[PDB]
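Objective 1.3, modelling of assemblies. Example input:
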Amino acid sequence: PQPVDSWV
Amino acid sequence: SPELGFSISGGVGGRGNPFRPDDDGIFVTRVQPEGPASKLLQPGDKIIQANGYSFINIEHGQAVSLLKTFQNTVELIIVREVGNGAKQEIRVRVEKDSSVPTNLEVVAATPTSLLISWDASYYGVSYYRITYGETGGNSPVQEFTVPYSSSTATISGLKPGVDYTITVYAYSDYYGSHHYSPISINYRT
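Predicted structure (tokens):
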């Protein structure tokens, strides 16, 4: 599945 | 470019989160081991404030853009379930701190296909985009994505005896606004 998160 | 060492999911109008189906808040999702957040935050922590800014009602991209502009130390207030109903509000301070990926190579090739590899890094990347096109060509590139856990990809449907330029992009966010410096190779089938 496509990701739902982003790195910060 | 990330320096807090964790990912977030959620936000009003976002793609949701894996912890709480009906909550549109911002949630810590993955945490880089031995990174700045490793002793302080855990998957499922809901961020409600960062450096005095409310994260209630915030959109995903707004949260990312805010967190990225903060300098040096970031004070976060999170809500954690402990948790038979029970809840804690926790205040923590997290101290922020080429190409991605590296060492792009062809492992195996046939006249119409290539297996490429690159160095696995399992943190800091939301997804990879792979592009390929004839070197010096003016047609739009072909492209596809692979998950953060991949360090190989197979490119199929190539013309034999043609020079191709292959590029790998590593995006830190799911919506594709930030990628690290990409890496490319040329290969002839």
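The beta strands of chain A are 5-7.
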